[model samples]
Target: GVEEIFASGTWHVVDFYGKANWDKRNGEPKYNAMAHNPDKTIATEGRKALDIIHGFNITFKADGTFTGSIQNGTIEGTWQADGKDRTVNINFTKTPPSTSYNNEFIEALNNAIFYQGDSNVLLLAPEGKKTYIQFAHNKQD
Candidate 1:
């Protein structure tokens, strides 16, 4: 059931929705991090990159193939179900440009936990943060 929908078609990152604050920790991590912008519309370098990251169409194939792009360059990867948990781990055999900005984006997708909703949303737990990079799934024909 989940697999079918996942491997159905292409998906784009339309937008993001989340928030954050400095009630406990006193750091700037939440500013651009998901802890502050679950909405995913903050003006952080990371968020801004993700906002248009949808320009890269993420496609899941029926044969466990994963295809996507990064800043105009295409990336080929493989994906598989964790089986124990609802996790879809991806490994990009062909790495994209390695930049601080792009590295963060790639790590987020490395082992995304599937949160099945009206459709399916992917969750990536940022290192020591409240806001997880939530990738909203927008199906494309």
Candidate 2:
């Protein structure tokens, strides 16, 4: 699913945080998230798999914290900013086990930094954070 979407648009990595809706202040990175095609806006009807144009609107923060949604769960997580280097290798367990992908709706929570697209809409990790099917939907509505 994700591979399909990336194959179409020019993906890019952007940084954002907190209800910050494209309100650039200092050196804040801004990205306009759409449904698909990047040319059209996906409907926000909360559908699935390219059925309903657009679904959840996602944005990133300066702290590397992002706000987006998958098929259902609301994804939220930041990165570990060490000096000039940034990473999210630090894990925050809920139940117990050091590693779990059960309710693991997290596509890329504390995984390796993954990139594909250019610098607009890319994957958080090679296999990270929220998995919402889009792209095709942009063609529907």
Report, for every candidate in turn, its global Cα lDDT versus the true structure: 0.53, 0.32
Q: What does candidate 2's lDDT look like per residue over 19-133, in tens digits?
A: 3222221222222232233444342321222232133333345544455443444445543433233223423322222222213324334444433332234333323322321
Per-model TM-score on C-alpha atoms: 0.59, 0.32
Best-performing candidate as measured by TM-score: 1
lDDT of 1: 0.53
Clash count (model 2, backbone only): 18
Tell me which residue pairs clash in candidate 1: 16-39, 17-38, 17-39, 18-38, 18-39, 19-38, 20-36, 35-131
Candidate with best lDDT: 1
Q: For model 2, what is the C-alpha lDDT against the true structure?
A: 0.32
Worst 10 residues of 2 by lDDT: 21-30
**Residue-level error in angstroms, candidate 1, position 83:** 6.2
